[PDB]
Design a protein around this nucleic acid. Structure first.
Ligand SMILES: [Cl-]
Ligand code: NA
Ligand code: NA
Length: 324
DNA sequence: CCGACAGCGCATCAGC
DNA sequence: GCTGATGCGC
DNA sequence: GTCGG
């Protein structure tokens, strides 16, 4: 990356404000600035140059000036030497443990990986599985593996019901060569926004993927959202694949486009698009787009992803151009 | 200067 | 058990 | 922390 040193600094600051300071808006602010800087096709020479970018203000510009001049940030150096901040930042790396639980664990003396591995009875089910695959969940997923995972999911899904349609979204759909997880969008004609003609639609698919030993664990599971763990099958005498995070989302068939837009991402892209929608007088979720007194109106007709872009007056962006 | 910052499903808890 | 507020991840 | 009213 051209400005990897700068974006890493802002990303580290973002993680600090979220996990330690618990300031979610500062967290989003740093990420937004890091994102727009990452896409900047020039090697930044000064904070003043960066300040021209939307999302970069005075304070970050000062930090950029310090980093370019010294190669480091004194603010981050002090944070790294803070034991409380270090313990919290580590504990939050476990899936299921947020800023509140992390700080609570530190008060109770639980602040290391070794402490967690002898205090599993103090964790909820989500946190326990997150600890179980602490290392694997921080591993990236090669696209080659994502293809194998996709092939398994789609085929096992077909065997349950041919009317099922499974679409792999996330960074994979954006054509990335590596993904953080697998986010599957599932639709079935019996499940629309109007009615649910068949129960256990999500359960059947999860069951099947568990039968073929693809899904190994379950973080959380409901009627429309599944969060769990999956693993590719390895060959004889071969080292096992790392366990992977997989999300399966049952979406209303008639609301596929709003759904596929959200689950495609990226996260920063979604936040920017939804924020821009509000300025245009619209509100967007993974189901519909509505005009917005502040009271949301009736859903607008959507026959493509592009229609959502057209409403908020944006030139259409292919999934590959939504990786911010 | 200063209000608003995207939006939601599942797990968990407390008040009744 | 129902309702609503929180934490959490995305 | 940054932006728009
Ligand atoms: Cl809606
Ligand atoms: Na700016
Ligand atoms: Na966490």
């Amino acid at each position: 990356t051209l400005n990897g040193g700068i974006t890493d600094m802002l990303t580290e600051l973002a993680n600090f404000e979220k996990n330690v300071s618990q300031a979610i808006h500062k967290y989003n602010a740093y990420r937004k600035a890091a994102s727009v800087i990452a896409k900047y096709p020039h090697k930044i020479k000064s904070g003043a140059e960066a300040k021209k970018l939307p999302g970069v203000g005075t304070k970050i510009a000062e930090k950029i000036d310090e980093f370019l001049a010294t190669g480091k940030l004194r603010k981050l150096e002090k944070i790294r030497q803070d034991d409380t901040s270090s313990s919290i930042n580590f504990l939050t790396r476990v899936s299921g443990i947020g800023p509140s639980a992390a700080r609570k664990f530190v008060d109770e003396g639980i602040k290391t990986l070794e402490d967690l591995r002898k205090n599993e009875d103090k964790l909820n089910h989500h946190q326990r599985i997150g600890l179980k695959y602490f290392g694997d969940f921080e591993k990236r997923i090669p696209r080659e593996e994502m293809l194998q995972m996709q092939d398994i999911v789609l085929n096992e899904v077909k065997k349950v019901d041919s009317e099922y349609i499974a679409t792999v979204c996330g960074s994979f759909r954006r054509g990335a060569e590596s993904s953080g997880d697998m986010d599957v969008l599932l639709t079935h004609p019996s499940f629309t926004s109007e009615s649910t003609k068949q129960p256990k639609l999500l359960h059947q698919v999860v069951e099947q993927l568990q039968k073929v030993h693809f899904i190994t664990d379950t973080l959380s599971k409901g009627e429309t959202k599944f969060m769990g763990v999956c693993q590719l099958p390895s060959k004889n005498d071969e080292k096992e694949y790392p366990h992977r995070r997989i999300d399966i989302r049952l979406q209303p068939k008639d609301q596929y486009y709003c759904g596929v837009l959200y689950f495609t991402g990226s996260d920063i892209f979604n936040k920017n698009m939804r924020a821009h929608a509000l300025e245009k007088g619209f509100t967007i979720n993974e189901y519909t787009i509505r005009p917005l007194t502040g009271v949301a109106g009736e859903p607008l007709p959507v026959d493509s992803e592009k229609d959502i872009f057209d409403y908020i007056q944006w030139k259409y962006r292919e999934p590959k151009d939504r990786s911010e």
